[PDB]
Structures are given as structure tokens and as C-alpha cells.
Amino acid sequence: NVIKTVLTYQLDGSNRDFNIPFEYLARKFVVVTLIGVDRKVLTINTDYRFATRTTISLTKAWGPADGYTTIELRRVTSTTDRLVDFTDGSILRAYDLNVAQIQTMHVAEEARDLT
């Protein structure tokens, strides 16, 4: 019942750091948007920086200003692009095989959570 992939934090004023609990196969998969007026997706380069594997930091303090009441952060996993590719020369790692299932299991989380 619980929605692991999608989760929203009330801004409650100036909160710089937010925790992302779900696993993500790529730093580009996590998408952060503010909520309250329009779904404004934030740019990775300047608008927000991670600074840690598990928590993000937002440059400006949105709070209740600009009509953005809450922050929404979720993971969207790219289906077309594959993180791990196998070649004949390359050695089989535990890394490479794990990402194979883990990515397509994350996509199944997103479909199940959005339902």
C-alpha cells in the first residue's frame, strides 16, 4: 500500500536538506519538483545539489514563498537506456549482474506505485 518511489515533504519554511529513501540506479533518475502552483521540475546543475548519496540540498529556500507549498521528489527509471551492457571481452562482475535485475525491478516499483 505504501508508495516507496513517490513521496512528498512539507516545506514548512526554509528546509535546505531533504532525505531520499528509495534506491536509485542513477543520479539522473531522481527528479525533484515543487508543488503548490505548478509542477516545476528542478535542474540538477544549479537549482539543487545532492552533496550526499541519501540527502539532497536546495539552493534557494522556497518555503511558502512563490506559492510552492510542498516539495515532491520521486524516481523515474529510464526504460530505453540500460545502465549495464555486457560484452564478450569484459569480466562478469557482481556489479554488472546486479544492476541488470535491480534496474528492471525499480521500473516495476514505479508502475505499481503509480497504480
Binding site: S90, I91, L92
Partner: peptide
Amino acid sequence: RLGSNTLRAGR
């Protein structure tokens, strides 16, 4: 065994 030189694919 995973992570071993001789494990590489197609071999």
C-alpha cells in the same frame, strides 16, 4: 566465481 579473470563472458 564472480570477479575472476577467467570468468569473462563468451569464454
